[PDB]
Amino acid sequence: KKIFKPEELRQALMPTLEALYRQDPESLPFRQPVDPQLLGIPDYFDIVKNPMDLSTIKRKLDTGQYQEPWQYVDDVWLMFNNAWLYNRKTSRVYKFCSKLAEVFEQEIDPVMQSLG
Ligand SMILES: CO[C@H]1CC[C@H](n2c([C@@H]3CCCC(=O)N3c3ccc(F)c(F)c3)nc3cc(-c4c(C)noc4C)ccc32)CC1
């Protein structure tokens, strides 16, 4: 039973977020919030109720909004889940999402090792 102290957590989690950002081009569609007006997809917020993206995860990590690892993981998962939900499996964005989820599953493992 491990309970992370706040700044040990930020230092534990930030490398996993940097690993997502470092995927180029795969992280590019995820670096800023989806703007349905600019992209001419007005149904986006009908399907994606709770948007999430790397810039929002970064800001939340930087402002102590993740008190335990599972809250951070939840938001990362949410940004993947939204992208798989909204996009077709053949699309670049969908395949890029899968690449990032693959990276995340490797990079989050040491933190998970510490918890269990
Ligand atoms: C850096 O400026 C950005 C790059 C990605 C651009 N983009 C693009 C542009 C549109 C024009 C065609 C194209 O190839 N884009 C693009 C550009 C860079 C990419 F890495 C990429 F995978 C796709 N499509 C986006 C889709 C999404 C998306 C997500 C995430 N979930 O549901 C949807 C819909 C998000 C961003 C998309 C928008 C401007």
Other beta carbons less than 10 A from residue 51's beta carbon: 16
From the CB of 59, is ligand 1 less than 6 Å away? no
Alpha-carbon gap, residue 97 to 105, rounded angstroms: 12
Alpha-carbon gap, residue 113 to 106, rounded angstroms: 11
PDB experimental method: X-ray
Q: Integer distance in angstroms from the first to the last C-alpha of the chain?
A: 7
For residue 50, the domain's CATH number is: 1.20.920.10
d(CA 86, ligand 1 centre) in Å = 12
Using a 10 angstrom Cβ sphere, with 0-12 exposed, 13-18 middle and 19 or more buried, the burial of residue 1 is: exposed
Specified resolution (Å): 1.9
- Unique residue bearing structure tokens 């230092």: 11
107 touches 15 (CB < 8 A) = yes
Q: How many domains does the chain have?
A: 1
From the CB of 83, is ligand 1 less than 6 Å away? yes
The domain of 26 spans: 2-115
From the CB of 79, is ligand 1 less than 6 Å away? no
